[PDB]
């Protein structure tokens, strides 16, 4: 499973066909100031705590490949529905 580093595809902002650069979308780290974290602080007391003592869930046999297509003119990225592959070479 390869895919070119660059190719020519419609840019939804420029509304024209021109080169794009493909890259990998890396999952960030959850911050501590969102309201879920504040709720987790407010709900920690004595004993059980509901959602925040849930065991972590399982996983699926193969995840999707999450990619971001960034234009080379306006530098504005856009995302597309992603396929599912095990080994993903990124064939420039």
């Amino acid at each position: 499973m390869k895919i070119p580093k660059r190719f020519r595809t419609y840019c939804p902002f420029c509304k024209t066909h021109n080169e794009v650069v493909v890259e990998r979308v890396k999952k960030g780290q959850a911050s501590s100031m969102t309201h879920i974290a504040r709720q987790k602080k407010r709900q920690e007391g004595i004993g059980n705590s509901g959602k925040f003592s849930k065991v972590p869930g399982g996983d699926k046999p193969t995840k999707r490949i999450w990619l971001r297509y960034r234009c080379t003119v306006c530098k504005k990225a856009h995302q597309r529905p992603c396929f599912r592959a095990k080994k993903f070479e990124f064939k420039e």
Binding site: G45, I46, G47, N48
Partner: protein, 196 residues
């Protein structure tokens, strides 16, 4: 500045750790530890605070040092089956402050007088000390008085065990007005105790 000596005493007790009062604390703590739970003392330890809280030099007015432990409400683990939220009791401090406990013990010791106010006078690693001002309502000097005859009334009995003192009203959530006091006035019981 033309200033009374009550002001100087007030300043001296403003920051105890950085004046001559620290040495006096060192001497006094030993004598206080040797004493009992409740003790009658002739003069208040801090004159300015007592005069501010309504102390006068007359018959029928008594002042007492009470002794109360530190820490929260010492609570027992439930014997039978709780639900894991009511099962824990080690971190559950009380809902009653320590001044209130002190004044209630003083009231329990003196069955004929009535509590007026109290104030903080010292503390160490095991104990805290307060002084409680008590007034006798059946003494003629109090009866003749115009600023104290309100205590000779049939609604002032048990004034400390019904949360009518200043610390009691602090603990009832009625030290202020407005936002936050929706369920604390005119009483805790009136709203099914959802305030406090």
């Amino acid at each position: 500045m033309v200033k009374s000596f009550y002001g100087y005493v007030r300043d001296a007790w403003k920051n105890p750790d950085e004046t001559y009062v620290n040495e006096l604390r060192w001497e006094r703590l030993q004598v206080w530890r040797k004493q009992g739970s409740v003790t009658r003392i002739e003069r208040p330890t801090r004159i300015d605070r007592a005069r501010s809280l309504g102390y006068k030099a007359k018959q029928g007015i008594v002042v007492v040092r009470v002794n109360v432990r530190r820490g929260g409400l010492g609570h027992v683990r439930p014997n039978r089956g709780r639900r894991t939220q009511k099962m824990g009791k080690n971190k559950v401090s009380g809902g009653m402050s320590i001044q209130r406990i002190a004044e209630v013990r003083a009231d329990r010791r003196y069955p004929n007088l009535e509590v007026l106010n109290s104030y903080w006078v010292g503390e160490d690693g095991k104990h805290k000390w307060f002084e409680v001002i008590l007034v006798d309502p059946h003494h003629p000097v109090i009866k003749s008085d115009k600023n104290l005859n309100w205590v000779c009334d049939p609604s002032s009995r048990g004034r400390a065990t019904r949360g009518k003192t200043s610390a009691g009203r602090k603990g009832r959530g009625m030290a202020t007005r407005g936002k936050g006091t929706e369920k604390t006035r005119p009483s805790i019981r009136a709203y099914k105790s959802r305030g406090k």
